[PDB]
Design a protein around this ligand. Structure first.
Ligand code: HEM
Ligand SMILES: O=C(CCc1ccccc1Cl)NC[C@@H]1Cc2cccc(-c3cccnc3)c2O1
Length: 464
């Protein structure tokens, strides 16, 4: 309770903390419900304590711009450390200060619009694989869990985009790539482990010296050894097939420098950042399409208009379909799977008429802002027309932050948007999705440290 009076001396409202725990007991409702309630009962700026760590939540759009964009390299550069990380500390989402700039500069060209257009043909083949595996699921006459089929698709894309591994994960669940990477799931930051280390951050160094990695150490060593082999196998072939992430990092390495261990770490973090994130959002999108068939009809018609005769999609055609962009954007508003954006104040600073002392974690409640009635009308409803051509300019880019903002935003934003849209195009033009009985009509979200449905979304699939 030594630092539990900091927000009081600043005259900042917030829930009264308890000794040794701060406000973690209020997390019994979850991150999403906790943030919205505090926004309602405290206004635009409030604070709380994750253990003894003071967290300041800001909702003013100008302040959000100042933290994420304006005073980023100066003040708000890094995120709060989250656990014993091991050699994965060099991951760009985990890197800090100079290493982040050096790694982000070395990794930015991998996510260029030209590079994405060079990867669309690879992501297309596994859309066709998804349709084949979905044709059987629809033929059985029984509901289908979308997480498994989309998880198979995301794995197939990730393996083919990060390496040359071409597999049908839904039908080949034994390839060492499929087995170990299928265990790279999201982190429930409200489980016993993360709750304890948030309350006892002094135990993080103890866990590291015991070599207790937050990521599955068996999966990391397998992937680390695999990359070491694939660099040797590539050292023999050496064709003009540099169309995947690993090759693009290898050639840049030969061209400061990107170390071999740094090379491996970034490869793994791309797998983790894409596996369940893509499948979760795709499941959320298909749920809203099923319970709002009017949207599903217009989207299917627009795909048929741009792509007649079930035509294969294209980078140019994907960037052409506007209602698809409207559907993806609206779903990302209702369900921002990050739920929060965090930066650490590295020095005493005054932003927009507020004093932020050193060490405070400044947070942006993405979920709370996306469903705040002040900026959005009928927030709980699914209305894609919020992002129509003449309506998508009043939306404040710092109140809708599904991929973050500033120089530390999502580096795979356009890859995922392309990857998710390519899946939706290829699936909607071959199948229709109806709500079965088991489908939860009022979709209920989980209370944990993840933005996931409590019950997995099961839907009925029929051929067209
Ligand atoms: C549709 C799924 C995804 C969503 C909704 C999402 C969302 C986000 C958000 C909100 C952030 C934090 C931005 C900020 O704090 O300003 C972030 C960071 C990041 N994401 Fe994603 N992301 C997704 C998929 C991916 C994928 C597939 C990759 C793989 C390339 C990826 C790589 C990263 C990286 C590297 C960062 C950290 C960048 C930095 O700190 O310099 N993300 N993402
Ligand atoms: O996952 C998380 C946080 C949960 C999350 C963040 C962003 C998007 C989705 C999620 Cl569920 N922390 C583990 C590492 C460290 C890190 C920092 C910032 C973003 C990511 C991340 C994760 C997934 C996709 N894009 C970025 C990240 O991964």
């Amino acid at each position: 309770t030594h630092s539990h009076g900091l927000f009081k001396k600043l005259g900042i409202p917030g829930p009264t903390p308890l000794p040794f725990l701060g406000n973690i007991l209020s997390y019994h409702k979850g991150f999403c419900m906790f943030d919205m309630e505090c926004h309602k009962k405290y206004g635009k700026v409030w604070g709380f304590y994750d253990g003894q760590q003071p967290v300041l939540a800001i909702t003013d759009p100008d302040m959000i711009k100042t933290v994420l964009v304006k005073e980023c390299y100066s003040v708000f550069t890094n995120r709060r450390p989250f656990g014993p990380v091991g050699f994965m500390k060099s991951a760009i989402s985990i890197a800090e200060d100079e290493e982040w700039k050096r790694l982000r500069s070395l990794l930015s060209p991998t996510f260029t619009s030209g590079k994405l257009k060079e990867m669309v043909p690879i992501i297309a083949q596994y859309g066709d694989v998804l349709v084949r595996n979905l044709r059987r699921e629809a033929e059985t006459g029984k509901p289908v869990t979308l997480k498994d089929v989309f998880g198979a698709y995301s794995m197939d894309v990730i393996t083919s985009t990060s390496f040359g591994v071409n597999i049908d994960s839904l039908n080949n669940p034994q390839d060492p790539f499929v087995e170990n990477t299928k265990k790279l799931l999201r982190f429930d930051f409200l489980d016993p482990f993360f709750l304890s280390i948030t309350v006892f951050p002094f135990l993080i160094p103890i866990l590291e010296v015991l070599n207790i990695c937050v990521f599955p150490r068996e999966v990391t060593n397998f992937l680390r050894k695999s990359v070491k082999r694939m660099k040797e196998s590539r050292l023999e072939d050496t064709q003009k097939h540099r169309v995947d992430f690993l090759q693009l990092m290898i050639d840049s390495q030969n061209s400061k420098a990107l170390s071999d261990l740094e090379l491996v770490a970034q490869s793994i973090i791309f797998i983790f950042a894409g596996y369940e994130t893509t499948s979760s959002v795709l499941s959320f999108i298909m749920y809203e399409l099923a319970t709002h068939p009017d949207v599903q009809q217009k989207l299917q018609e627009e795909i048929d208009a741009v792509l007649p005769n079930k035509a294969p999609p294209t980078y140019d055609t994907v960037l052409q379909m506007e209602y698809l962009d409207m559907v993806v954007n609206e779903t990302l508003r209702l369900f921002p799977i990050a739920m929060r954006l965090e930066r650490v104040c590295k020095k005493d600073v005054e932003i927009n008429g507020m004093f932020i002392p050193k060490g405070v974690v400044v947070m942006i409640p993405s979920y709370a802002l996306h469903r705040d009635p002040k900026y959005w009308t009928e927030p709980e409803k699914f209305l894609p027309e919020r992002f129509s051509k003449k309506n998508k300019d009043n939306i404040d880019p710092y109140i809708y932050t599904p991929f973050g903002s500033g120089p530390r935003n999502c580096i795979g934003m356009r890859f995922a948007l392309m990857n998710m849209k390519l899946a939706l195009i290829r699936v909607l033009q071959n199948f229709s999705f109806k709500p079965c009985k088991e489908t939860q009509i009022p979709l209920k979200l989980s209370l944990g440290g993840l933005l996931q449905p409590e019950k997995p979304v099961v839907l009925k699939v029929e051929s067209r």
